[PDB]
């Protein structure tokens, strides 16, 4: 079951197992006496406030944090966490994955606007993924009006809540009148309430099931897929003008320097994105059918965590943008209370619709976007762009004698 | 409950969840194999008398202590200790803090001396707070006569007390006699016995029924009035401060210790002004029951060095007494728990303390002495640096493990 | 019980109590303050596969593993456990090891070819082995034809047992007729089906009467097959050898390894098959004089090596993050340190012995093996020349000295 | 009660709380990334042997011993063993301290020599002690005919114990007999048996109390206190022609590199030791009033042991353990075995030991020849500041980088 | 009860409380930042054997046997042990110290062969002991005729025994029947069957009535026989012996080893006469011998040159013309077993037994060494390519330390 892909035209392909960031980490930490990895400054004020906490998993705290570095346990257990933010953990026949409901919205809404017969596999879904956003993006720009990228709750324990209150199929009426990329795909017809044709429902009943309900009738589905169709925009958004031939000075990864021994025309609009999509997008859900939006880019998520957050120069050594991963590892690692871990899971998705909603409400998403990605983990180019959405972070080898 | 502080102007803000030198210090040892941090002179002389001390918390005296530093143990508990100089540890409804008492004085004596309104609010006692004590202090510098910034005690016991003995509201009649700055304000028609009372009016108004006419209980007039001379020293020391130039002498360099995590002059009482409007009121918003002691902690410092202040000419000090309050506090409550030493040793530390400050505001040219004593014992060079001493009660610099 | 071994020309001798790589690479682990030994590319992706292991035994974890270098308790027994590749598990009085079984055919080929008086005693199998090895190969070379190297099976089961199922004493008639080597040798005349059979007459000879033919008792003719495979790349790669010139490429520094234990131009060049001859001579022969039950894996360990890897050989760089490669060794440490179970160990074993035939028959079917066998030690090995090379088949690795301070 | 010395002109005065040795040495320890102390050849030889002996505290065997230094548990316990070579162990009220018995007898010869009131307080005793000390030493110089510097025993039981035995107060007859120092202030007239005036006796009853009995009586006081002079006068004629405002190519302390942050006519003779006097006896004296002369001169205590082994001519080695013995059975009876007695008679081992040392030192033609060499070839001094400090520390510590 | 020893003239003497080796050896692991000793190819091949060994004791397994060096706990175990071959274990009365009984006989031989007076005191066995080793010599080589330097056993059981099978006095007939030693003192009238018997003279005036007659209990006179081999051997490789110039392949370095404890001085001169013939030998007579023996009286041979020892084991082992490495562990055997025997196992009867095969490997050396046809030629080769030792002066202190020392920088 051994897979591979590739992140930006002209790179290496990369073999692996079963996930690339948690088999790319550890080779890190194999050179302790000559460097050690750093994976910039989201990372650094992490781990200092993460040495700081009083409740925090002592296995966590191993030496190479001290060392102007993250220990591999660290590092990927914040990795692991923020990769699954998106998973489903309520067990529900009638849930479809966020990344396969957000296919299934973006496939209808495509043939709903071409004359393109409706996909028949799931292979189909991700055929022309790139065109299938494109239409979908320039749509949306010309979406006029009030509204932003938001659930509306009218009620705290609503907020709580990720699934509709009281085992209820549907959210309560306010609920999506402010989403405009809801509006949108509502005015086009997809998810009517009923004879309406229902082109998302004709997707799910030939590919997933009769299990799967109308959107509009078990609305948990349209919620989680519209999230997910958010961090694919997002996505499509900032690589849209994207170039790797020119090697940037601003360019902080570095494979040769990562990898050592074991490393052996202009790109035109949509073609950094179609090569990820071709490359990286469709050989991890070919083998990972079920993966998580969060799994496929946890960079966007870590954005997403990081534009809530946001005089002149400042120094932060707060750690509320860690409480949510940390109340993950607490609750696994030290403290193992099912219950606990559940809400910690539910705490962690909700900022992250709350930070996609502030990005997406920038006038100007890929520029906040570029602005988070340079500022807190060191990101400068398209390059570095696109491979910090696949991995997270982008490390650099530093060498531990000055 | 996140919030921002700033200490001079063209400089970071820090966001802090509650404590600056809390929070900035333990990052200083995450950079082991190549630097660790140095607090000075004072610092290297504590962390040498410290590892001598026959009795010591064993936890305070780890390897970092060894490898020309402090461990971060030892520096942050010696900073919290200092930082608690003058918090309450009396469990009374009739307190206020040393901070809240000395800002009732200063506003109620800039009331008397110009009929602005009183103060309604708490932000209120914070508002133009460089001008409210710009105006005491100009009137202190001109009261002429005999006596200084001490406390009159005329028994033993008495001294050892910092409460009025036998669960007394008053202290003895000689108590307050000789301070100037008492005097000032008595004068000025502050704290009557029955006159209208100005203190208790913006007490009333702001801090309950509870706290009584100063002149009644005396406790809230004797920790306002020495939080009162730490407001004063700390002005002093900034009024003509000027921290745009980069001084060739200056210790602190926040791009060294922080790394990736980082004109016209400024007139007179600027500096101070920038602190209060940046730092002081930030601080007071977040703890408003903080002490005046963890506000500035570096003139608590810079205090109980000036009682040590004989032969003169090269001398070496490897002498402990400077460092057996804040050592006696440590002992007690990290190794022996004993609740009514502890308390004795709380009250040992105030006592020093306020003893210092006497030296220091008795000194012909107050900001002078304050200035020498934060170079030589602390490494301050500068006007930058003074501020920051202040705040974060040292100075660190990051030395490299290999040289 | 002491022996002495020479790998190359004007190389020094190396006096050992039983085996080379097991009291050499000890010796590279005493000077930990100035430097550590490295493996090559191969094992610096086997280490970090190794640490990433959630199964794995905690022993060979060390801290050295993490410092640029290999453990000397992961190298030892990853080498170890490549010598026993071929190594006989099956306790049996029917059969040879892979080896002898080697020999034999080799030696039976040669007398059917040259009509030279069959061996009489076990030295007469190794005596002039580079002519019996050279004559087979330039034969082997004319063989023209469909076929490969491999055997052929008819169900994963059959796939799944080194010996024929359902305990028989023959193969399926389909197992040997794709394999080039056995169709040559069964054209000459050797293992035929009771006709003379010059391989029955040098094992009664020499390793009694309980060997049966080899067309009857088939397992000796699989085993045999097998390790002449292993002889005939061994010989193919050195066959123009040269290893006086001081190459720049050159690996392997003894002078670096040994230090004090080390006591140290016009030469003539040495001429085909002589590079092969030297090895023959000074390491093979005292080799099996010492361990007469020597399987094929204890001499050439890199020579599997290089078939494990052969398995594994999209267009364009390629960073290689994938642990199959190790499956098979790994699964052997764990079931020896770990789990100590006969049953699953066995298994192990024989996925192991499984996955070197497939890889030996990938560099054998390639129109240049020695070429294929060449980049595989230099990408994966890191050996430049002949010496480098020779040294590889023997060592299973070419260990350099790194310093531990830049 | 913190108080301040100064041991040579020119250089920092020290602050301390108690004790300078036991201060200052801990703070050598604080730089153990960059830098070592390291003590002199016969501290390197001592770290050498403890090591090496089979009994022995393992508290005194950390690491730093094997780092091309001594440990600070090993090197204080060290110092603090000499230091406390003629400290009195006896619980009597007739004893005075070894430097108090030595100041009466040095003022009572001033007294009877010259037309000099005698001392009424302790400070009298110590006013113009390098002028008192200077009297009695060029006396001692003219003083010709046999004899030397050591006690005369008559059986091996009366040379294993300090005081006389059979609990009597006085010694045998032969005890003092070949005495120098003794036989030049008995024909003064000093300590007469009685009604001859007692000049000792006057200044013990003046200052300290009617207990102490005149010195021909109990004699305790007498053999203490002629070797404790004998301590004094080496230190005298050591320092005697001193200088040490020049900077000597010799230098081995080198106090900037050891404190770092924390830190022309010339002297006439007598003027070092009249410096040490007044900055630094005078001082110690008067923070701790019964201090032994070990604690005071600790160098001289170990330039007296290493006098006893001063066998063949050219260079050599010593591998030996004999001259750490006393100091090392010392320590193995407090922090190991702990047993009372033992402890007492090694302690008495290296009192006998040192007043052995002693007698060689002042029997030699040319004392501070002789402890120049002691000083330079066993603790590598080599001027005369290397000597005042060395006296006082009991060693020379030096900043070794742990990084060649 | 310290004592002075010199080994090379114009060297220093060194003050030792009971032995120099033991004394020494610790010293050079005092400076471990700077750096760390190392003993030679011989002892660095123990070193790597040692840490490979199943059956080992844990305690000589430390650190900085894996730092280019050797544990001060190796190292001083191995010198012990080496120094301890000749030493009696049988608690009888009976029994001479090996350099005893060698002592008895040399002085029994220039007495039956010079003029002179038979020893009263042992110090006379001391005095003049290079000219009595030099006459027993000299004879030696004109000694023509079959025969060795070794005992003669006709049964494995009597191999492996040090004293005679059955409890008896006398070993069999044919046991020093082969030897050239034996067979020259006999052919002297030395230690005859009852005729005058010299050894018995001097036995019965020095070391009391209970030393029998050497004819009459045997063991004296074997163990007595194998310690004037290496007396002989001994003598022979520094017959020649020069120490004044400085050799460009001269190992031992004191100045390096001691440091601050080694006080110079004035260094000998290179241009100096030269050491005639046994000179060298005489000053490490009676600079090393006679005062280890003055304090230590019943050191056994192996204690004052467990060189020759070493050097003994090792010839046993000398096939192949060329470079050559060594990593095989049987020349490592009989040391490690008596490590094992008396750190791990702690058995008295196999400690006893290894002690055994230690003497034995020993004695079968001796042999080898004596019997090549220039012993002091073989015994060169053996001390440069096992020992580091390129000179005269590396030689005598490799015959007295058992290793030659050397410091390595921690930091290259």
Redo the contacts between chains.
């Keep these: 079951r051994?897979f591979?892909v590739a992140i930006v035209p002209g790179?290496?392909?990369?073999?692996?197992?079963r996930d690339?960031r948690g088999?790319?980490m550890?080779?890190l930490?194999?050179?302790?006496?000559?460097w050690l990895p750093s994976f910039?400054?989201w990372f650094?004020?992490l781990?200092?406030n993460a040495?700081?906490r009083r409740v925090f998993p002592k296995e966590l705290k191993g030496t190479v944090?001290?060392?102007?570095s993250t220990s591999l346990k660290l590092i990927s257990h914040t990795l692991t966490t923020v990769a699954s933010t998106t998973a489903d953990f309520f067990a529900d026949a009638r849930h479809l994955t966020d990344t396969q409901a957000a296919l299934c919205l973006v496939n209808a809404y495509f043939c709903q606007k071409t004359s393109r017969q409706l996909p028949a596999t799931p292979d189909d879904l991700l055929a022309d993924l790139p065109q299938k956003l494109d239409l979908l993006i320039t749509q949306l720009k010309q979406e006029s009006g009030p509204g932003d990228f938001s659930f509306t709750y009218s009620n705290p324990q609503e907020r709580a809540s990720l699934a509709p209150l009281n085992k209820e199929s549907r959210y309560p009426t306010a609920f999506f009148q402010r989403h405009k990329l809801h509006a949108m795909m509502a005015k086009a017809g997809l998810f009517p309430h009923n004879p309406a044709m229902d082109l998302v429902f004709a997707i799910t009943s030939a590919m997933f099931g009769s299990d799967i309900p109308p959107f509009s009738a078990y609305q948990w589905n349209l919620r989680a897929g519209i999230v997910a169709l958010e961090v694919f925009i997002l996505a499509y958004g900032l690589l849209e003008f994207g170039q790797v031939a020119r090697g940037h000075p601003n360019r902080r990864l570095n494979?040769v320097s990562l990898?050592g021994?074991?490393?052996?025309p202009m790109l035109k609009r949509g073609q950094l994105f179609s090569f990820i999509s071709e490359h990286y997008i469709i050989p991890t859900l070919q083998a990972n059918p079920n993966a998580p939006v969060s799994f496929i880019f946890p960079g966007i998520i870590l954005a997403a965590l990081e534009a809530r957050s946001t005089?002149?120069?400042?120094?932060?050594?707060?750690?509320?943008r860690f409480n949510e991963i940390f109340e993950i590892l607490n609750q696994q690692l030290t403290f193992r209370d099912p219950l606990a871990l559940l809400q910690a899971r539910t705490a962690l998705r909700l900022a992250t619709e709350e930070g996609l909603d502030v990005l997406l409400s920038h006038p100007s998403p890929p520029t906040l976007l570029q602005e988070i990605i340079k500022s807190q983990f060191g990101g400068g180019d398209d390059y570095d762009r696109a491979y910090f959405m696949v991995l997270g972070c982008l490390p650099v080898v530093l060498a531990?004698?000055?």
């Design positions: 051994n591979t790179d290496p392909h990369f073999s692996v197992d690339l088999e790319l550890p080779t930490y194999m050179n302790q006496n000559q910039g400054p650094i004020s781990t200092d040495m700081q944090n001290f060392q102007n494979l990898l021994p074991k490393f052996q005089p002149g120069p400042f120094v932060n050594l707060t750690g509320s531990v004698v000055p």
